[PDB]
Amino acid sequence: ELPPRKVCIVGAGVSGLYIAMILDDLKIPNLTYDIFESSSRTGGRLYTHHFTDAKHDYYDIGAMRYPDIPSMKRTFNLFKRTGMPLIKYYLDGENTPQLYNNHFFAKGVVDPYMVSVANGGTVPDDVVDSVGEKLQQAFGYYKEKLAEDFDKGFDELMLVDDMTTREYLKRGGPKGEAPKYDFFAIQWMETQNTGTNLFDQAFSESVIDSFDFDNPTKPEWYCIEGGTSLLVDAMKETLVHKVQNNKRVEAISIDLDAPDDGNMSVKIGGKDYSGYSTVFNTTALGCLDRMDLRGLNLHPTQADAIRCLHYDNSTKVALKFSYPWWIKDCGITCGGAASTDLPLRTCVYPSYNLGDTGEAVLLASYTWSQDATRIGSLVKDAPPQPPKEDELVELILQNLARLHAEHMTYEKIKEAYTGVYHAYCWANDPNVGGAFALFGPGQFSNLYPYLMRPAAGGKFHIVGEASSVHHAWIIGSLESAYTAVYQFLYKYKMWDYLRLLLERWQYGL
């Protein structure tokens, strides 16, 4: 029979909970685990903010929307296994405004935003109306390969991973045989396609982003009615060993001079927790880098990956209104999102309140990168009280009025605002230190393989979305967790249970 063994799961986000879910399902004799979570809260970047207990009065600060595409099958299987109430999420709605250079988009008009050279701007005339087509030409080949087989497509994409998106567009691809674009053409493509400055990160990441958001299969999207935190609730409920919150791991070690399976330990608040046969670290890499890892003897390049792999920032701001004025007054009855060059950048109309006539939540601002850092500078842990003006609220109200100026006035939007809002900047969260991995040029092809290198003789695993090829998605966390469990069972040669893992979990259970 199997000897008694214990493993340590660092962090209680979806990766850590999924590891525990797999172990609980396999029911390996005499195997137990501790799950330590630094926060008082469980679920990590799955985080629903409830303004009240009212059915729809919430927004998702973390994960919100799921495209139903083959590479995401494991995520949807988790949704099914846990009985999640899925409803349609509308990525594109009806009547959503798009506002750039203070002009609204109009179909069938040349340069509606008046940013082209012909109109006194610097965007090349042959670019301004063509961003979709030109980026399709840039990304399209690789998206098609990714759609056939994600892993094979990814390996082929790695052959160009040395370039930033800007570099690829500037030079016409790796041999110069694709179209070459000037600075202002690329700037406009970035402005239309993504967050400020993000074309200065990996071309491969832009490709994958486009694969996920504009997938060749033209997928249905879903969200969880009641918020994504319902998944965390469901996952917690089934745990054989409950999450231990307020436990922040500060060091991880292995004693190589000890013959035992159980020769690993972690330190929490100066105290040693020992006897572990494997440690799965599930935290964002910023949190991992702060730990004292000397006791693991990590490869220097693996250590570099932990410090240097790039993370994007993201900020969300949600406001409550006495009625859904966007639905009633503006005819935006189907969800979707408005985009603009104004500071808010993106206004997302909830897909879960469409029938409500009373109080309603609007995700008024959703930003990334430098845009998110700038909104984030206004987001305080203790928002300013009414004896003072809230600069962030006034900014959002003013931007919303401009974006909605076709049907709304600032006065009306402000009058409908209830005075209740919430905002969150992920780079300001001490338990994450960023929104999610978005790698720089060369990182996937050079550093990532060392991040994923076996460590501590095969007993230490760096697990999570960053530790996968699908960054910024639940799927990345789940695939990473599944793969680490595979490696743990293999290491200890538990062949019955590895066979069972494959039988039950290969597509997810």
Binding residues vs a second copy (CB under 8 A):
101-102, 114-115, 120-122, 162, 164, 166-167, 170, 183-184, 187, 191, 196-197, 200-201, 248, 250, 269, 286, 289-290, 292, 294, 299-301, 303-304, 307-308, 310-311, 313, 341, 343, 370-371, 373-374, 376-378, 380-382, 389, 391, 394-395, 398, 402, 427-430, 432-434, 440-442, 445-447, 450
Residue 279 contacts ligand FAD per CB under 6 A: no
Strands 271-276 and 5-10: unpaired
E strands of 43-104, at which residues?
48-50, 58-60, 66-67, 86-89, 98-100, 103-104
**Overall size of the chain counted in residues:** 509
**Burial annotation 441-453 (CB, 10 A radius, 16+ → b, else e):** bebbbbbbebbbe
Q: Report how far Cα 152 is from the mean position of its chain's Cα atoms.
A: 23
Query: What's the min distance (Å) between Cβ of 133 and a second copy?
Result: 22
Query: ∠ at Cα 357 (353, 361), nearest 5°?
Result: 45
> From a second copy, ligand FAD, none, which one binds at residue 93 (CB under 5 to 8 Å depending on kind)?
none
Residue 293 contacts ligand FAD per CB under 6 A: no
> From ligand FAD, a second copy, none, which one binds at residue 436 (CB under 5 to 8 Å depending on kind)?
ligand FAD
> From ligand FAD, a second copy, none, which one binds at residue 303 (CB under 5 to 8 Å depending on kind)?
a second copy
State the Cα–Cα distance between residues 261 and 275, nearest whole angstrom. Answer: 8
- Only one residue has tokens 């290969």, namely 506
> From a second copy, ligand FAD, none, which one binds at residue 282 (CB under 5 to 8 Å depending on kind)?
ligand FAD
Residue of 22, 63, 305, 408 that binds ligand FAD (CB under 6 A): 63
Q: Could you tell me what percentage of the chain is helix, strand and coil, using 3-state DSSP and rounding each to the nearest 5?
A: 40, 20, 40
Interface map 444-473 toward ligand FAD (x if CB under 6 A): --------------------xx------xx
Asked if residues 168 and 160 have their Cβ atoms less than 8 Å apart, the reply is yes
Residue 497 contacts ligand FAD per CB under 6 A: no
Query: What's the min distance (Å) between Cβ of 343 and a second copy?
Result: 5
Asked if residues 403 and 347 have their Cβ atoms less than 8 Å apart, the reply is yes
Q: In the complex with ligand FAD, which residue's Cβ is closer, 260 or 292?
A: 292
Query: What's the min distance (Å) between Cβ of 487 and a second copy?
Result: 22
Query: What's the min distance (Å) between Cβ of 473 and ligand FAD?
Result: 4
What is the chain's alpha carbon radius of gyration, rounded to the nearest angstrom? 24
> From ligand FAD, a second copy, none, which one binds at residue 505 (CB under 5 to 8 Å depending on kind)?
none
Q: In the complex with ligand FAD, which residue's Cβ is closer, 127 or 462?
A: 462
Asked if residues 424 and 318 have their Cβ atoms less than 8 Å apart, the reply is no
Query: What's the min distance (Å) between Cβ of 84 and ligand FAD?
Result: 12
With H, G, I as helix, E, B as strand and everything else as coil, classify residue 308: helix
Helical H segments across 149-239, by residue range: 150-157, 165-171, 183-193, 203-213, 229-238
Residue 345 contacts ligand FAD per CB under 6 A: no
Structure tokens at 124: 């090349």
